[PDB]
Design an enzyme around this catalytic site. Structure first.
Site, PDB file in Angstrom:
ATOM      1  N   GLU A  36       0.812  -1.231   0.062  1.00 19.82           N
ATOM      2  CA  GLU A  36      -0.177  -0.048  -0.159  1.00 19.82           C
ATOM      3  C   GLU A  36       0.631   1.227   0.018  1.00 19.82           C
ATOM      4  O   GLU A  36       0.245   2.374  -0.494  1.00 19.82           O
ATOM      5  CB  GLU A  36      -0.935   0.399   1.413  1.00 19.82           C
ATOM      6  CG  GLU A  36      -2.256  -0.905   1.302  1.00 19.82           C
ATOM      7  CD  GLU A  36      -2.977  -0.760   0.242  1.00 19.82           C
ATOM      8  OE1 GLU A  36      -3.349   0.076  -0.380  1.00 19.82           O
ATOM      9  OE2 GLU A  36      -3.485  -1.947  -0.168  1.00 19.82           O
ATOM     10  N   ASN A  47      -8.540   9.186  -7.029  1.00 25.56           N
ATOM     11  CA  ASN A  47      -9.096   8.207  -7.804  1.00 25.56           C
ATOM     12  C   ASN A  47     -10.314   8.838  -8.615  1.00 25.56           C
ATOM     13  O   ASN A  47     -10.890   9.813  -8.072  1.00 25.56           O
ATOM     14  CB  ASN A  47      -9.781   7.056  -6.967  1.00 25.56           C
ATOM     15  CG  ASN A  47      -9.358   6.718  -5.464  1.00 25.56           C
ATOM     16  OD1 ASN A  47      -9.941   7.188  -4.451  1.00 25.56           O
ATOM     17  ND2 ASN A  47      -8.248   5.691  -5.602  1.00 25.56           N
ATOM     18  N   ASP A  49     -13.386   8.358  -8.274  1.00 22.64           N
ATOM     19  CA  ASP A  49     -14.401   8.544  -7.215  1.00 22.64           C
ATOM     20  C   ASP A  49     -14.597   9.947  -6.859  1.00 22.64           C
ATOM     21  O   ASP A  49     -15.378  10.440  -6.453  1.00 22.64           O
ATOM     22  CB  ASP A  49     -14.004   7.595  -6.225  1.00 22.64           C
ATOM     23  CG  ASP A  49     -14.315   6.393  -5.988  1.00 22.64           C
ATOM     24  OD1 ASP A  49     -15.428   5.929  -6.569  1.00 22.64           O
ATOM     25  OD2 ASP A  49     -14.068   5.395  -5.133  1.00 22.64           O
ATOM     26  N   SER A  51     -12.543  10.800  -3.995  1.00 24.70           N
ATOM     27  CA  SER A  51     -11.786  10.337  -2.790  1.00 24.70           C
ATOM     28  C   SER A  51     -10.038  10.273  -3.254  1.00 24.70           C
ATOM     29  O   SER A  51      -9.736  10.447  -4.433  1.00 24.70           O
ATOM     30  CB  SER A  51     -12.371   9.065  -2.233  1.00 24.70           C
ATOM     31  OG  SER A  51     -12.975   8.353  -3.052  1.00 24.70           O
ATOM     32  N   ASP A  53      -6.913   8.283  -1.084  1.00 24.56           N
ATOM     33  CA  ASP A  53      -6.381   7.137  -0.238  1.00 24.56           C
ATOM     34  C   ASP A  53      -5.223   7.948   0.778  1.00 24.56           C
ATOM     35  O   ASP A  53      -4.357   8.029   0.320  1.00 24.56           O
ATOM     36  CB  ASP A  53      -5.730   5.962  -1.023  1.00 24.56           C
ATOM     37  CG  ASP A  53      -6.794   5.363  -1.794  1.00 24.56           C
ATOM     38  OD1 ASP A  53      -8.046   5.243  -0.952  1.00 24.56           O
ATOM     39  OD2 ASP A  53      -6.585   4.740  -2.876  1.00 24.56           O
ATOM     40  N   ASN A  60      -8.924   5.345   2.512  1.00 26.05           N
ATOM     41  CA  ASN A  60      -9.721   6.153   1.470  1.00 26.05           C
ATOM     42  C   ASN A  60     -10.918   7.224   2.012  1.00 26.05           C
ATOM     43  O   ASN A  60     -11.492   6.919   3.216  1.00 26.05           O
ATOM     44  CB  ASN A  60     -10.731   5.296   0.581  1.00 26.05           C
ATOM     45  CG  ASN A  60     -11.542   5.756  -0.354  1.00 26.05           C
ATOM     46  OD1 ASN A  60     -12.700   5.747  -0.301  1.00 26.05           O
ATOM     47  ND2 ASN A  60     -10.894   6.242  -1.359  1.00 26.05           N
ATOM     48  N   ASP A 102     -16.174  -4.313   9.321  1.00 30.30           N
ATOM     49  CA  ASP A 102     -17.222  -3.696   8.775  1.00 30.30           C
ATOM     50  C   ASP A 102     -17.284  -4.479   7.364  1.00 30.30           C
ATOM     51  O   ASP A 102     -17.723  -4.244   6.212  1.00 30.30           O
ATOM     52  CB  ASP A 102     -16.811  -2.349   8.430  1.00 30.30           C
ATOM     53  CG  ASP A 102     -17.449  -1.530   7.335  1.00 30.30           C
ATOM     54  OD1 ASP A 102     -18.665  -1.360   7.200  1.00 30.30           O
ATOM     55  OD2 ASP A 102     -16.759  -1.604   6.224  1.00 30.30           O
TER      56      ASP A 102
END
EC number: 3.2.1.17
Length: 144
Positions: A36, A47, A49, A51, A53, A60, A102
């Site tokens: 990562e 990204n 999106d 967002s 990271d 994120n 989650d």
């Protein structure tokens, strides 16, 4: 400002509860943060999106923290995102141990299921307690 060296990290994450958090023993967390970020506490990835990271463990901003930029941010950790881009990994830990409660654990880290999952991840905490330098290294749960 703090790119770790493998056992330094490995041991820090021992110092903070990831060693066997919901199934995952240490070597799995040293190997997701490598793939990562290369233990770099300051990465930042945008990204398609909307967002980004953040941090060491690439968390994120759609779900987790909050930069005041992602649309529809949910900020489950209820932590500003930039609490994550810093040198002491207490926040990054306190959010990652919330990601793996989650869902079915570490499959949020795309680098972990790809480059770490199905490896002998124990080898990432070998040579270690913080690089000790006698053949390979330490012990931290499941002695048998």
């Amino acid at each position: 400002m703090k790119v770790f060296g493998r056992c330094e990290l490995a041991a820090a994450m021992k110092r903070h509860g990831l060693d066997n958090y919901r199934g995952y023993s240490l070597g799995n967390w040293v190997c997701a943060a490598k793939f990562e970020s290369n233990f770099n506490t300051q990465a930042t990835n945008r990204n398609t999106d909307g967002s980004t990271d953040y941090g060491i463990l690439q968390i994120n901003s759609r779900w987790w923290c909050n930069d005041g930029r992602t649309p529809g941010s949910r900020n489950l950790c209820n932590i500003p995102c930039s609490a994550l881009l810093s040198s002491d990994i207490t926040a990054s830990v306190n959010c990652a141990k919330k990601i793996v409660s989650d869902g079915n654990g570490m499959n949020a880290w795309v680098a972990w299921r790809n480059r770490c999952k199905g490896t002998d991840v124990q080898a990432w905490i070998r040579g270690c307690r913080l690089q000790q330098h006698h053949l390979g290294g330490a012990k931290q749960a499941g002695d048998v």
